[PDB]
Homo-oligomer: A and B are copies of this chain.
């Protein structure tokens, strides 16, 4: 079993999170999972949709037409967001809201925008891992503006994928591996080691209990390195 990148089965790709990446957002990060590069921004808006309950957070995902090996059609000109985009967006939104105590956010709405500049697998996991850092920077801004009702950060959140490649569970899939793997798992967890999201899919041979547990265990292991990178970035 030899991964295309020469990486070991339990080895993450080189990762880097850069804060204050673009100048307008209350929070802006360039997150890099190897060749996967995504810009995640957080935009604070006054008011809320239809609540009286707490604040709100919603997310959107986008890809540059040639962030991919083969050009992908611009959803703007096709006049419609595909199933994949909607799936990834919802995931991001759920994941980030799970990290917040919306009642302490105030009557504000946070807009998360994750745009893939260069894709090579795991854009959704990189997006969540990086968006969390951007989110924290944004909360510091709103706190400064005295627009919050306490510290809404419940707990850090990160994500990573796992897939069966050459019959072996490998961590943090790149495009080639994801294209070849018929069985994969996307996981979103917190600092406390709690799962907020687990999604496993099998196109051919169904994955059995031990198999799933094996993938789950590999993901948790690598999750620790991600939280570390997030903290390091926030302390830099």
Contact = CB atoms under 8 A, between A and B. Distances in A.
Q: Which label, helix, strand, loop or mixed, suits the secondary structure of the A interface?
A: mixed
Contacts of A201: 94, 196-198
Nearest to A187: B200
A192 interface: yes
Given A76-B85, A192-B206, A71 B43 contact: yes
- The CB with the most chain B CB atoms within 10 A, among A22, A37, A203, is that of A22
Interface residues on A, range: 35 or more
A98 interface: yes
Contacts of A86: 83, 86-87
A43 B22 contact: no
Interface string A37-80: 10101010100000000000000101011111101001111011
A198 B200 contact: yes
A85 to B, nearest CB: 7
A22 B89 CA distance: 23
Interface string A202-226: 1111111100110010000000000
